[PDB]
Scaffold this motif. Structure first.
Motif, short mmCIF file in Angstrom:
data_model
loop_
_atom_site.label_atom_id
_atom_site.label_comp_id
_atom_site.label_asym_id
_atom_site.label_seq_id
_atom_site.Cartn_x
_atom_site.Cartn_y
_atom_site.Cartn_z
N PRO B 129 41.70 42.45 35.84
CA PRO B 129 41.66 41.12 36.57
C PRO B 129 42.71 40.75 37.28
CG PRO B 129 42.07 40.89 34.11
CD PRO B 129 41.76 42.40 34.63
N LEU B 130 42.76 40.06 38.44
CA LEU B 130 44.00 39.94 38.98
C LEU B 130 44.01 38.18 39.25
CD1 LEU B 130 44.33 42.36 42.18
CD2 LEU B 130 45.13 42.27 39.76
N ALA B 131 44.66 37.52 38.52
CA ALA B 131 44.82 36.16 38.40
C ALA B 131 46.04 35.82 39.06
CB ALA B 131 45.11 35.64 36.79
N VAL B 133 49.27 33.60 41.09
CA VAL B 133 50.48 33.04 40.52
C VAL B 133 50.65 31.67 41.17
CG1 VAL B 133 52.00 34.35 42.05
CG2 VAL B 133 53.14 33.48 39.94
N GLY B 135 50.61 28.91 43.59
CA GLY B 135 51.09 29.05 44.82
C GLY B 135 51.28 30.13 45.55
N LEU B 144 41.13 35.03 44.25
CA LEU B 144 41.15 35.67 42.92
C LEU B 144 41.10 37.30 43.60
CD1 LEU B 144 39.01 33.31 41.12
CD2 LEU B 144 41.53 33.39 41.37
N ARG B 219 46.81 32.44 34.07
CA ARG B 219 48.12 32.83 33.36
C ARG B 219 48.66 31.55 32.77
NH1 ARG B 219 49.68 37.96 36.13
NH2 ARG B 219 48.23 38.62 37.61
#
Lengths: 210, 219
Positions: B129-131, B133, B135, B144, B219
């Motif tokens: 899963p690519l959350a 960062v 900003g 996402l 995160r």
């Protein structure tokens, strides 16, 4: 062995423009058929026997020719006319197809939105680290992407992929993934995705500090 | 009047052989010739041969003489093509096409059948899963992602929230990381949509009955 040469190999047109593709054989042919193929599907019969429109093709299309030269014409370009067009010879043996022509739909310039994504805890658990960058919805396909680790460029372990022109807005998207070992990754602090597109004189950057 | 069904995807080891079928679904099968055309990835079309079912006559493009052999079951109105001593050059998508009278225009075509001649073994993928960062994304609120790593047979199905979420997605063509494939998808939602709600990428790899689900947790 009749070879059919198609010109041009690729081209773009703004809607409203008149387009004229040509197919030329090495020897006289009685007639040419034309097919149209949108990415990811089976070709369709477009024009049979040089000038007879197949079923369901709009009136903006027309063909003609004799002997060795034949051509296809669209009076006024429209977004849904974007695809690859193949011309076909069948008055000999073996039957031959043309090289092909990819028609793109032009549009006013659009700049890409960038996004940087750090590795996930799950992948790190396993010991590998992939950093991903999305360059989305920009028009002119030509774009240049570079990666910088603590200011230094790196062209090793880089995998890129591009989408097809979007149907709803005629735009483009690109993905860039840099894969390193957890060691190489935790042995540095800054990661930067840098793109250079015509919509801007200076490169656009997005970064995160590990 | 019109519908042709071809077989599912194939993966054969070099030296091997395959038999693929095209089924006539609504017309006088033995009244027209059936054509087989080849197309290599991002490339052009090439004519293999044709057969007239009725009397089983056939014509073959020279280049494909020992490699191809055509057949058809009149009882079930089905065409068949078998390839031999398969190599890396035989990897392509094959099509079946019906000819008609005089003009001899191939009116209806089959959906197409993909063939892969390789020695690699079927491997399952990895879904991370690519959350974002905070900003690291520009406008359009939030974006996402979902990375799919290391699978061999190319077919993979990716969706968001079981299909309920289809607007603003982008799935990128798969690339080959030395014997394996990798793919990725993104979804751009509005600011008040994400943590408040839920987004999950659903992935399933057919060649290995694998069905993974990854919820994008912040995160």
């Amino acid at each position: 062995q009749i070879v059919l040469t198609q010109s041009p190999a690729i081209m773009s047109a703004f809607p409203g423009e008149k387009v004229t593709i040509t197919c030329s054989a090495t020897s006289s042919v009685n007639y040419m058929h034309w097919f149209q193929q949108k990415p990811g599907t089976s070709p369709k019969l477009w024009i049979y026997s040089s000038s007879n429109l197949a079923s369901g093709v709009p009136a903006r299309f027309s063909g003609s020719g004799s002997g060795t030269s034949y051509s296809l014409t669209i009076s006024r370009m429209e977004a849904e006319d974007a695809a690859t067009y193949y011309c076909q010879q069948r008055s000999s043996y073996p039957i031959t197809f043309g090289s092909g022509t990819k028609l793109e739909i032009k549009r006013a310039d659009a700049a890409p939105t960038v996004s940087i994504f750090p590795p996930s805890s799950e992948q790190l658990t396993s010991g590998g680290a992939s950093v991903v960058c999305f360059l989305n919805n920009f028009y002119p396909k030509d774009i240049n992407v570079k990666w910088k680790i603590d200011g230094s460029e790196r062209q090793n372990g880089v995998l890129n992929s591009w989408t097809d022109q979007d149907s709803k807005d005629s735009t483009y998207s690109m993905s860039s993934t840099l894969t390193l070992t957890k060691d190489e990754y935790e042995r540095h602090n800054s990661y930067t995705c840098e793109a250079t597109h015509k919509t801007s004189t200076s490169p656009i950057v997005k970064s995160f500090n590990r | 009047q019109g519908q042709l069904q071809q077989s599912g995807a194939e993966l054969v080891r070099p030296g091997s052989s395959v038999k693929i079928s095209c089924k006539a679904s609504g017309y006088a099968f033995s009244s027209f010739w059936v054509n087989w055309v080849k197309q290599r990835p991002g490339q052009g079309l090439e004519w293999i041969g044709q057969i007239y079912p009725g009397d089983g006559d056939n014509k073959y493009n020279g280049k494909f003489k020992g490699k191809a052999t055509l057949t058809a079951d009149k009882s079930s109105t089905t065409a068949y093509m078998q390839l031999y001593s398969l190599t890396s050059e035989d990897s392509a998508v094959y099509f079946c096409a019906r000819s008609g009278n005089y003009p001899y225009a191939m009116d209806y075509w089959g959906q197409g059948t993909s063939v892969t001649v390789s020695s690699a073994k079927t491997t399952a993928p990895s879904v991370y899963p690519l959350a974002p960062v905070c900003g690291g994304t520009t406008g359009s609120s939030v974006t996402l992602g979902c990375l799919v790593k290391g699978y061999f047979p190319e077919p993979v199905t990716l969706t968001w929230n079981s299909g309920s979420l289809s607007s603003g997605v982008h799935t990128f063509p798969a690339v080959l990381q030395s014997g394996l494939y990798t793919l990725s998808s993104s979804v751009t939602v509005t600011s008040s949509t994400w943590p408040s709600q839920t987004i999950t990428c659903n992935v399933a790899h057919p060649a290995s009955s694998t069905k993974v689900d990854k919820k994008i947790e912040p995160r």
